[PDB]
Structures are given as structure tokens and as C-alpha cells.
Design an enzyme around this catalytic site. Structure first.
Site, PDB file in Angstrom:
ATOM      1  N   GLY A 100       2.985   6.075  10.581  1.00  0.00           N
ATOM      2  CA  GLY A 100       4.357   5.897  10.128  1.00  0.00           C
ATOM      3  C   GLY A 100       4.962   4.553  10.468  1.00  0.00           C
ATOM      4  O   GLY A 100       6.087   4.267  10.051  1.00  0.00           O
ATOM      5  N   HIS A 113       0.808  -1.209   0.000  1.00  0.00           N
ATOM      6  CA  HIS A 113       0.000   0.000   0.000  1.00  0.00           C
ATOM      7  C   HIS A 113       0.843   1.262   0.000  1.00  0.00           C
ATOM      8  O   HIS A 113       0.267   2.341  -0.129  1.00  0.00           O
ATOM      9  CB  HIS A 113      -1.058   0.028   1.140  1.00  0.00           C
ATOM     10  CG  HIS A 113      -0.523   0.026   2.555  1.00  0.00           C
ATOM     11  ND1 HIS A 113       0.358   0.974   3.034  1.00  0.00           N
ATOM     12  CD2 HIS A 113      -0.858  -0.745   3.625  1.00  0.00           C
ATOM     13  CE1 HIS A 113       0.607   0.738   4.322  1.00  0.00           C
ATOM     14  NE2 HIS A 113      -0.138  -0.282   4.710  1.00  0.00           N
ATOM     15  N   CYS A 168       3.964   1.452   9.567  1.00  0.00           N
ATOM     16  CA  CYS A 168       3.752   0.309   8.668  1.00  0.00           C
ATOM     17  C   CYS A 168       5.090  -0.222   8.170  1.00  0.00           C
ATOM     18  O   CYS A 168       6.051   0.527   7.990  1.00  0.00           O
ATOM     19  CB  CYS A 168       2.858   0.758   7.482  1.00  0.00           C
ATOM     20  SG  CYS A 168       1.215   1.057   8.004  1.00  0.00           S
TER      21      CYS A 168
HETATM   22  O1  LIG Z   1       0.847   4.533   9.604  1.00  0.00           O
HETATM   23  C1  LIG Z   1      -0.325   4.134   9.689  1.00  0.00           C
HETATM   24  C2  LIG Z   1      -0.767   3.581  11.011  1.00  0.00           C
HETATM   25  C3  LIG Z   1      -0.600   2.304  11.422  1.00  0.00           C
HETATM   26  C4  LIG Z   1      -1.085   1.900  12.730  1.00  0.00           C
HETATM   27  O2  LIG Z   1      -0.985   0.774  13.206  1.00  0.00           O
HETATM   28  N1  LIG Z   1      -1.715   2.913  13.452  1.00  0.00           N
HETATM   29  C5  LIG Z   1      -1.912   4.223  13.054  1.00  0.00           C
HETATM   30  O3  LIG Z   1      -2.473   5.058  13.745  1.00  0.00           O
HETATM   31  N2  LIG Z   1      -1.412   4.502  11.802  1.00  0.00           N
HETATM   32  N3  LIG Z   1      -1.205   4.172   8.677  1.00  0.00           N
HETATM   33  C6  LIG Z   1      -2.602   3.713   8.718  1.00  0.00           C
HETATM   34  C7  LIG Z   1      -2.842   2.680   7.629  1.00  0.00           C
HETATM   35  N4  LIG Z   1      -2.478   3.248   6.315  1.00  0.00           N
HETATM   36  C8  LIG Z   1      -2.974   2.615   5.171  1.00  0.00           C
HETATM   37  C9  LIG Z   1      -2.830   3.184   3.889  1.00  0.00           C
HETATM   38  C10 LIG Z   1      -3.332   2.548   2.764  1.00  0.00           C
HETATM   39  C11 LIG Z   1      -3.992   1.335   2.870  1.00  0.00           C
HETATM   40 CL1  LIG Z   1      -4.610   0.563   1.428  1.00  0.00          CL
HETATM   41  C12 LIG Z   1      -4.142   0.754   4.134  1.00  0.00           C
HETATM   42 CL2  LIG Z   1      -4.967  -0.787   4.307  1.00  0.00          CL
HETATM   43  C13 LIG Z   1      -3.645   1.380   5.270  1.00  0.00           C
HETATM   44  C14 LIG Z   1      -1.085   3.691   6.276  1.00  0.00           C
HETATM   45  C15 LIG Z   1      -0.813   4.708   7.373  1.00  0.00           C
END
Ligand SMILES: O=C(c1cc(=O)[nH]c(=O)[nH]1)N1CCN(c2ccc(Cl)c(Cl)c2)CC1
Ligand SMILES: O=C(c1cc(=O)[nH]c(=O)[nH]1)N1CCN(c2ccc(Cl)c(Cl)c2)CC1
EC number: 3.4.19.12
Lengths: 306, 306
Positions: free
Chosen positions: B143, B41, B145
Site C-alpha cells: 500500500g 502501475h 507505492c
Molecule cells: O504496495 C506494494 C509494496 C511496496 C513495497 O515497497 N513493499 C511491499 O511489501 N509492498 N506493492 C508491491 C509492488 N506492486 C507492484 C504492482 C505492479 C507492478 Cl507492474 C509493480 Cl513493478 C509493482 C504494488 C504493490
């Protein structure tokens, strides 16, 4: 979101751990530049432990009575000396993995990570607090002496603890890296007792703020109290008194959530007097006191290290 | 003695973390040999997230749309491909810090360490379990992921988890290192719900054995039960059924303490039906289920790693 007992990444410390043997006794040492630091009781035998005279025991040793190994490599000891309760072994090779570091003596209530080691090899990492009675509630087996506690600030490793012994109650005691014990303990195998422990109030409040940040709000109320009214109730439950410096330390968490410190104190007062009614906060059924205000900020705002 | 939530030493993993940027999106990647692994993603924009078509989105990218940094050094991407939900970025430099490693898909109930990272930089390490509903209860901010979960066996790092998202209930979901989700989730920003969670029975029993090893015995009794009588009571409290394989796994802890598994099950039955009466076990007022039998042995018998 979420909230865990989070330790610092241990890699910068892992590369400093070595094995020290003197006679039939082996424990861990910390290798920084060309000095290996380790507990001085490595030089005791069974006959010495009840009442060692360390100056005598050390004059009877030479450099070659000390075997130091970093993995497979052996380090040649070229001098030795004693500073308080630590032995300092000068070696012929400077550790090329020496991080930027400093030695700090911490205060009760502060937290740090422990890298538990056996035979010079890292076994695991965990977070603990220095208790008000200057013990730590660690997890250590035979062979663990010389394991170290540390914090990381930006790119610098702050070493604050070296492990020396377990007390009869199952809690742990040791020194700063200049060899000074925390608390009234000494490095002899006599029976020593820790003083009575208290709960670290400013940490309990920091953890209640973490709870609010993560959506756990059932314990809040509209009341407030004064520092003096709170401290009267806290003393009855063996909580440390709260000072104005604690209130100011909690400032950033008060601002981020919009709940004044003295309002949070009113909630804590109610929880002390009425219990938690089989409800939980952040997954715990007890009030948790091993997170500092800085631990909470770090974990609920995301700081990293170089 | 003592018992803590202990993570593996993180140093071998720290040297593999990098920062990956595609467009305005940055997350973490795992650099092993000459491949960087990261959540696919990273290639989504705001317009794509509700329903991305990853094959389309990827055909529109070239190698130079991917910026990879390991500290200061930039890594030149010389190929890219998608495996399930992970992106694999071939780079021109093999990571000289690559440990001995393997990729494992773990089962519910198993535990692992998480190295939480931001911008390619390690921020902290903690231990968690894969829940029966295939989520983990982590601690992750924006941030995070691409942060990974791992175990260490002797000298080998077993990678088992890569972080992809947080669900609306505040728990976390991700994939193995071949890109297959744990559980029924998908990498789109739709609203997805985890199934109902259960308590991991074999882990609760392992932790009761740890309690006994550390001197906490108040919950023991002389009764015994059968596997079938126990499982009837456990189902009523949302505990996983106990199997004969679980009984055999607990063998070494039964032997070391002299308490038969089915005797320990009788104690657990009483604790489910009568509660803990405001008493604690190993410092907790709830029954803990994120330690495996192997975690307990490791921590109550002292194994290290190379
Ligand atoms: O960095 C975090 C994050 C992770 C976490 O555990 N907690 C939090 O608050 N933020 N994100 C949220 C999830 N996001 C995302 C983007 C595109 C798709 Cl397609 C999907 Cl499925 C997810 C990326 C950024
Ligand atoms: O390796 C452990 C150990 C540490 C721990 O925390 N838990 C545990 O069970 N064992 N020991 C116990 C303390 N011992 C010792 C020897 C001489 C002196 Cl003079 C003193 Cl003061 C202490 C060294 C070996």
C-alpha cells in the site's frame, strides 16, 4: 519490509510553534487555543541563572515585556501565569490550527518524536526514547528550548515533553507540558548529574522480533529460560528487569512470529554473554533499545493517522 | 550537542497526499496545483504485471475509471496522461495547500526524507540516502507505492523520489517525479537485481567530523596521507573513491574543527584496516554513511526553514 527510525508526521505540531521573546532572550513556545506555553527560564537574565527566584522575577514583569510572534503576525499577550516550570501566556487570538490534543506524562522506556525548532521555526524531526534515568539523548543547539515531543494516536496529538536544558554529559532534560520535570532536575544553571542509565530490555526484545520479521534469524536457538533465570543475567549487564507485564505486551509479536517470549529471552541471554561476533542485526552492531513493542507493530503492520 | 538521524518537517508534504484508486488497486498520489502524480502501475491488474504494455492499458481507460480522494472530498479527474513511468491525472480543483516546490533528480550519496503513506494518509517520516547502486534502504509495506521523498531548501520543497517497488533483497526502487527510474529498473513484476553496493566515503568522513564536534576523538592520529594512497586502501574495502570535489565539499567542517581532510582520511584508513575494537563513535559500532556534509553542518550549526 525494512526497518527505520521512524518519526511521526510533524505537520499538526508545526502549526503550533511560535517565537517568544522576553528582554534579550528568545526561545520557542507552543500555541494551543489562546495560550502559549514555554519554559519559565525565558524570564531569567545572566544574573539570575545560578539561583533564580521565579516568583520575584515574574512579579516584576508585565504583559508587554513578552513579545510573541507566529511567523510575521505578533500576538498580543493579555495575561501571564506560571504552572510549575512552564510559563503560560494568554494571548488575544486563538490558534486556528489547534489540533485535537492532550497532555500526557510518559514513563521511562516510552518513545516519542521531537520537533526541533529555532526562533519559532521547525528545523527537523527525530524519534527518541525517555531513558530510565529520565534524560533523553537528543540533538539540540542554542535556541532550541521550548521544542516539544509528541505522539499521535488516531487523530489526537499527545504532547509529552518540552525541552529545557542540556546537561554537562551532553544529554537533555525537560518537563511534561504541565511543567513537571522528568527526573530530579531543576531549572537553574547549576551543575546537575543524571543517574546511571540502564538498557530498556522490553524494547531490545521488541527489536529482536522486528529482526525476525525482516528475515534476520541467525541469533535464534532452541533453548528457553525462565523469567527469574533471565533477570539474573540481565542485572549483571545493566539491563532493566523484565516483568510479566512486559511479557504480555510482547504477545502480539510472539504470536505473529511463533516465537515465545521466553525463547527470545534465551537468545538475548546468549547475545549478552557471547557478543555478536561482528555480525549485525537489522543493520546495527549493537543491541538497540529505542523501539517499543508498539513502534515495531506500527512499523511492521502499517498503521496510519487522521 | 547530540547527533540524530533527523528528517525534514513533513507538514508541507502532508497536505499534498491523496488516495488514487483504479479498479481494485489503490495507492498514494501527490496533488500539486491541479495535477495528481502517481505510479503508472496503478492501471495494472494481476494479468498485466509480468509484462504490461502501458500504452494499451491506458488507451482502454477513461477519466472515470480513476477515483481520487483527498480525505473525504473526491476530486473529479478531467484528463489523464503518462510521462515515462508516472501517471499524471488532471483534476478539476487546484490544491490550495500547494507549497512552493520543484522537481529534482538527485545523485547517489545524497540524502532525503521519505513520508511513508497508506491510503493517502501519512504514517511516518524517516531519512535515507540514495545508495550508489540506485536503491534505497527504506521501510515500506503493502500500500506504500506513491509515497514521496523530498528535501526542503529555505521555503521550497524539492521532490526527488516516488516509491514504485520492493526488490527481492528487501530494498526499494522508484523514480524521480518526471517518471524516470533511478538505476536500471523497470516497472514490471519480473525479478530484478540491484548491483553491488559500495560505502559512500565522503559521507563517512562527514560523520567522523560530526563525531569530533560532539567530543568523540579517540580515532584521531597525527598521520596524514595523499588522495591516491587513501583511494588505494578504500577500493580494497568497497568504499567509493574520493575526489577533489569531495575534499572541497568538506571544507567548512575541516575549518570548524581544525582537522585537515587528508588527516581525517588517515584516521579512516586506520579504522578500515584495524576495526573499531568494540569502541563506538556517536553511539554506533559501524561506520555510518547516510549523512552528507550538508546534513552535518545543518545539524551541528542549526539551520531552519520557512
Ligand atoms: O504496495 C506494494 C509494496 C511496496 C513495497 O515497497 N513493499 C511491499 O511489501 N509492498 N506493492 C508491491 C509492488 N506492486 C507492484 C504492482 C505492479 C507492478 Cl507492474 C509493480 Cl513493478 C509493482 C504494488 C504493490
Ligand atoms: O538554548 C539553549 C540550549 C539547549 C540545549 O539543549 N543545548 C544547547 O547547547 N543550548 N540554552 C541552554 C540552557 N539555557 C538556560 C537558561 C536559563 C536556565 Cl535557568 C536554564 Cl536551566 C537553562 C537556555 C539556552
Amino acid at each position: 519490509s525494512g526497518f527505520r527510525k521512524m518519526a511521526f508526521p510533524s505537520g499538526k505540531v508545526e502549526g503550533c510553534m511560535v517565537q517568544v521573546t522576553c528582554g534579550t532572550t528568545t526561545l520557542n513556545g507552543l500555541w494551543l487555543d489562546d495560550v502559549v506555553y514555554c519554559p519559565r527560564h525565558v524570564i531569567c537574565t545572566s544574573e539570575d541563572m545560578l539561583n533564580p527566584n521565579y516568583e520575584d522575577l515574574l512579579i516584576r514583569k508585565s504583559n508587554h515585556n513578552f513579545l510573541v510572534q507566529a511567523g510575521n503576525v505578533q500576538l498580543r499577550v493579555i495575561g501571564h501565569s506560571m504552572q510549575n516550570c512552564v510559563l503560560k501566556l494568554k494571548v488575544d487570538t486563538a490558534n486556528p490550527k489547534t489540533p485535537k490534543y492532550k497532555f500526557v506524562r510518559i514513563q521511562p522506556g516510552q518513545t516519542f518524536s521531537v520537533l526541533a525548532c529555532y526562533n519559532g521555526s521547525p528545523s527537523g524531526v527525530y524519534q527518541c526514547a525517555m531513558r530510565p534515568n529520565f534524560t533523553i539523548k537528543g540533538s539540540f543547539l542554542n535556541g532550541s528550548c521550548g521544542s516539544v515531543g509528541f505522539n499521535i494516536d488516531y487523530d489526537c496529538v499527545s504532547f509529552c515533553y518540552m525541552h529545557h536544558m542540556e546537561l554537562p554529559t551532553g544529554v537533555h532534560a525537560g518537563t511534561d507540558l504541565e511543567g513537571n520535570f522528568y527526573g530530579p532536575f531543576v531549572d537553574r544553571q547549576t551543575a546537575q548529574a543524571a543517574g546511571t542509565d540502564t538498557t530498556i530490555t522490553v524494547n531490545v526484545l521488541a527489536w529482536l522480533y522486528a529482526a525476525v520479521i525482516n528475515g534476520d534469524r541467525w541469533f535464534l536457538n532452541r533453548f528457553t529460560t525462565t523469567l527469574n533465570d533471565f533477570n539474573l543475567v540481565a542485572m549483571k549487564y545493566n539491563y532493566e528487569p523484565l516483568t510479566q507485564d512486559h511479557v504480555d505486551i510482547l504477545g502480539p509479536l510472539s504470536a505473529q512470529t511463533g516465537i515465545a517470549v521466553l525463547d527470545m529471552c534465551a537468545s538475548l541471554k546468549e547475545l549478552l554473554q557471547n557478543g555478536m561476533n561482528g555480525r549485525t542485526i537489522l543493520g546495527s552492531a549493537l543491541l538497540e533499545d529505542e523501539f517499543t513493542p508498539f513502534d515495531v507493530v506500527r512499523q511492521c503492520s502499517g498503521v496510519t493517522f487522521q
